[PDB]
Point group: D2
Chain length 411, copies 4
């Protein structure tokens, strides 16, 4: 029924963002929850402020890399559960980057770098806080502190792409005074996108614009009750098991799974964040760079559909995971489980005719071609039953796109 507000339409066009976890935890490289889960002495853990130099943090390099990977926004942790702030809190707290050797407002560097690359800057903010005794001792006063921290971000950095709130789930029963928090954001940042990790329950507040979901969600996501405000959706993937850097977490997902995940998000009508954890001093680690390079080659190829493509009621035949995305000028077949083509005696698996069918395309087609190399595909249609069948040829030897995309040109 209702259609997205302009700022939410713009959000859905972003498609892909980079999530960045960086805090004091990064110096230990054993996960962002280390303070709580490893039962550390608070006083000793908080001494990490003294070695927070940010000596290798280069916001320009990060924004350039985000642009190259095809991301259109970046979510940076401005304050995680540990409660340390990566920006100048202007007197709210001494546990911030201005009281660290770094002495730079990192958020200011980040916002300027994003603007130069035409990326939207988003601010992650943890609402469950392990630093301030207010959280357990005086929750109402905690709410004021949380709100003021958000307000500083709202008033000192120019227009903000969005806020990414995490952690109300810690006290599911409490009154978090969302009307006041969100209202303040609307007042200073009317165009900001408000994302919530615990947006659902029916949404947790009318001002929420986006709700997060499990990456494995099978079907098109929920957009709100009819006649209510349309709410977008977003999924997240981290490269291993942890969000902050974790040196001895070897359990990385394949680049292939990462590409399939990104494609999948688009298929169910969501944005996707791909997460990297910076080193203690703020560098992109070499492993993350590898994943970004590979994803970048895919998103460059997929550019005609990744941003504007939307789910459409077109299904694939029995036993395939193929799907279709719609833009106003074209449909795109996203085709999975292809193999590489050999020659003569050398059989790699992609060589035979490979009919892939779809149900729901009722218009006559002029031409279909692979985005990666412009090869024209042969096809048949039954317009009455709305059946399309293409011969989905395998990859040219030497290449393998994991999710291959064919563009349909209508008559």
């Amino acid at each position: 029924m209702t259609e997205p507000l302009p700022r939410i339409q713009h959000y859905e066009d972003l498609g892909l963002g980079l999530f960045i976890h960086w805090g004091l935890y990064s110096q230990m490289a054993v996960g962002e929850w280390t303070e709580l889960i490893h039962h550390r002495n608070q006083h000793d853990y908080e001494q990490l402020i003294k070695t927070f130099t940010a000596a290798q943090f280069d916001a320009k390099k990060i924004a350039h890399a985000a642009k190259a990977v095809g991301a259109k926004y970046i979510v940076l942790t401005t304050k995680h559960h540990e409660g340390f702030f990566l920006y100048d809190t202007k007197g709210l707290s001494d546990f911030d980057v201005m009281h660290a050797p770094a002495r730079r407002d990192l958020i200011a560097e980040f916002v300027a770098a994003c603007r130069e690359e035409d990326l939207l800057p988003f601010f992650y903010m943890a609402t469950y806080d392990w630093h301030t005794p207010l959280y357990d001792d005086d929750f109402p006063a905690y709410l004021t502190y949380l709100q003021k921290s958000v307000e500083v971000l709202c008033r000192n950095y120019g227009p903000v792409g969005g806020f990414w709130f995490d952690g109300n789930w810690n006290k599911k029963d409490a009154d978090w005074h969302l009307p006041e928090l969100y209202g303040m954001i609307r007042h200073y940042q009317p165009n900001a996108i408000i994302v919530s990790n615990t947006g659902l329950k029916q949404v947790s507040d009318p001002e929420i614009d986006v709700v997060t979901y499990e990456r494995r969600t099978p079907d098109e996501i929920y957009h709100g009750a009819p006649n209510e405000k349309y709410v977008a959706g977003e999924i997240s993937i981290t490269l291993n098991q942890h969000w902050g850097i974790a040196a001895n977490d070897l359990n990385y997902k394949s680049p292939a799974e990462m590409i399939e995940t990104v494609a999948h998000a688009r298929h169910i009508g969501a944005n996707i964040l791909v997460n990297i954890g910076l080193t203690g001093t703020g560098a992109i680690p070499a492993a993350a760079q590898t994943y970004m390079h590979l994803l970048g080659r895919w998103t460059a190829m997929a550019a005609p559909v990744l941003y504007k493509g939307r789910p459409v009621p077109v299904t694939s035949a029995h036993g395939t995971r193929d799907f279709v995305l719609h833009t106003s000028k074209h449909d795109f077949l996203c085709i999975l489980d292809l193999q590489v083509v050999g020659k003569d005696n050398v059989v790699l698996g992609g060589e035979g005719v490979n009919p892939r069918s779809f149900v729901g395309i009722g218009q006559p087609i002029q031409r279909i071609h692979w985005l990666d190399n412009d090869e024209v595909l042969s096809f048949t249609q039954d317009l009455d039953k709305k059946v399309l069948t293409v011969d989905a040829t395998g990859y040219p030897y030497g290449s393998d796109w994991v999710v291959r995309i064919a563009q349909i040109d209508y008559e």
Copy 2:
């Protein structure tokens, strides 16, 4: 029945090797079979010799990286199907590195680098050759050329760890004169390990030491007919779908699958080779470096068992993929499918007691501990039925080893 001859015994102790594909094909970055598969004009393809500078080939860097990853040998392509030689063929052919701008014997650099790191140098040699017309026109004379090219390798580089022969499968019916070829190797290099891609029912020549197998072979490999020479086994994994570099092959396996495959080779009684394809100019590509760093962290942890551990008739309980490796002083439980441990309300999957059982351990045990952190495991035994059950605790937050290894200390 028979046991390995000493060179073979030493070979099985190597455990892990690095496979390196580098040739003229590397300059195109569309796979090592590009000349045949892409139906290239030979003269045009072979012009790549003129730009083969090897400007970024540093054998010391490669040997260092192999050492860091825990490899004990390196197999370098000395001549692939394209038929170009990476060494000085001393007049046998003009299609060699001495006729390229590089003007350096790359095999000589490689052998010196290996020796300084205590790695065995192995020479891959393609027996199916696309360059010399002898191959199709005058097979007997081809055999002489092949043999002479191996003789140069046998006589000019000091003691060689081994030869890795690939391509007799191209003419399954021909007489390859293996006794003469292998006999010549035994003359000059008595201690060299001879590996064959299609060396297997019956082995293709008595002089073969190692035969290759698919990585997914489920059970302990075949060692030869009972009264006959024991032959070792080896599996291979490439990181994507290609052996030479392939810039638009995004279909990389996960680091986790790589670790599981290394453990699996050891479990079935084989060595494992992890393949990297160099850039046109001979650099290790950034993606391969990422995989090497991850594997290196695992093999450093697994060092007590990776080299000397051998299969043993001890099975795991129903529904697990766990297995056991034996050394003279210890058994090691290799345990898969573990999760990370959270704390209190924060549940990551690994926190409950996790009984993993094995059948075939008959001796009383004194202590069991994880290699990664020395945590002591609780266990129970039934000595009559030869049952061991351990509580396989999950990973400490911030880490995940994919295959976790517990050392058993017997009473």
Copy 3:
């Protein structure tokens, strides 16, 4: 909360037989045939003229239920087609008293159940294709539905329960459940009320669940009435008889589903569709006999066994049931034991572990043959490991059950 007595008794029933029989049975193309095959209503309703019930024997049905180890039977008293298998005493002419059968089949059924010590349950469809009231005057339909249930509550003596199906057809409507269930409580205070569709009315006693539900079912909010649960399985794809539906489940899957219901804390109904004239088909008998062999073996745990917070090791589907005197290990994926050269899969030691048993054990034995199992315990971590020996050649129970005797 603790379940009301009648609900405790319900959970002890364990297994029931579901019986689908109506005019649809004469065509043997599924119970929804009238709607799904778009039949002419007038022509379909003529099936009343050939409804003889010539082979319906309520005593044979009760016998079959007893033999299979069922403790109750749910009979379709009126399905969506809207034909009543009992005397509606003037409410409708579309009932068995206007059919050639001329027998109140519900009265036969109730008597047959009581003689075998089974509880009789009445299925009633609330979505009705026969009366124009359903679409054209919903409030008056509610009165008709309620009256049809009132007859069942007032003409047969004490009744085991009612099984309501079809409120799902109008999810938004006011079904006036307080009045319907209030009337039931008035005449039948002890009847179990089951509903196919937070619970929809305080008077509901049991709620249905999909047979594949993975985890222990929901019993109500704390401080509220405890509600039981039930799953259902039909042998092929249809509930009424369907002659050319060859897609029968394996007997093994049937046994696994019965065990699974107990594991999640639910009863289970196994459905049979009678022939046009009311006979149990031969195919259904075969399933019953196989099931009967299993439930006879499982008798010490099938009725009183309850879920307990004891899990099985990684990679097994084994589970535990608790009675007040014993725990029982329900062990899946066993193979048959050969001899020497003949290896059938079950011969090696087969350690199966469980977490959550904290008491020292004296003895463990298979229910099927009394073989004593070896085991080890770690009482601190609450680990039990048994060597689950494979089946004796010539037998295979699908779900094998070991009884634990505590010290």
Copy 4:
């Protein structure tokens, strides 16, 4: 090489019934009971005294085979236990003439087969637990085995075939197959010789395969004799009757296995184990009735259909069979079609594709109900795509078959 006439005839049989019946049947714990349960030989062999065959009716068995669509029957004439179901004419006292039955059961069987136009096949175990010759004087055992086969070749008229099982017990021994098979060829030149486990002797006509074999079977080296193939399925885990083996396969799996045999170019035997006294058990009758409905529907292709190099699209298990007049699409994983708001899974258009059909098609229709299917072709790439409509409510064939009529 083209197959020999008798082998061509064999491949046209398609489906046979396998029947296990011996002394073991009286104990109902599997046909290997004597060896696997380590029984006292003397005590086990006393079962001859209660072998009455009181319920064996060869005419009923032949009728049931005909009804299920089988074209031949393989009967165990002597299993490992070594008891003979026929008159061995002095070769052994451990035969049916020395049992209360006092009837040549093989003679009854052959006559019953002939009246129903079925080929009679004789299973003979070559691994024998009765005669001490087997372990103590193997060469003399071969003479005894050969003589026992000679009786079957000389006293019963033309024999459809022999089904030899058990050379696998001594893989290395010289079984003197030239002499055994040569003797069969002399007396029964037209008999099919089947061997259960390069072929072991030129005279073998059929070789057995695992039922799960994925690809078209091996027919012999080129320039050599063509050898046919056969797979077998038993209903539970045992071949002889086993009362407490509840681990039955689904009827659906049975149908899929029959279709599968044809797909790989093999015949299929479906096994039943008789009761001690020679009756078909009720459970087996249920499976036979279900299979019979499928084979009656599949009759146009079940006998003459042959594999052909036409493959199905990615992600389906569909396949094609060729006769000289038609191709047939065998389509799996279909669902039932509901109506309007009632969704059963089969209602959307369901494009199923095949590669390898190069000729223009006039019409395609389902064998079960004659519904005409819509389709498209790309003749250059040899692609056919059909809309494989789901089952009419009330039916489910498991493997549905569409006949192609070419222009």
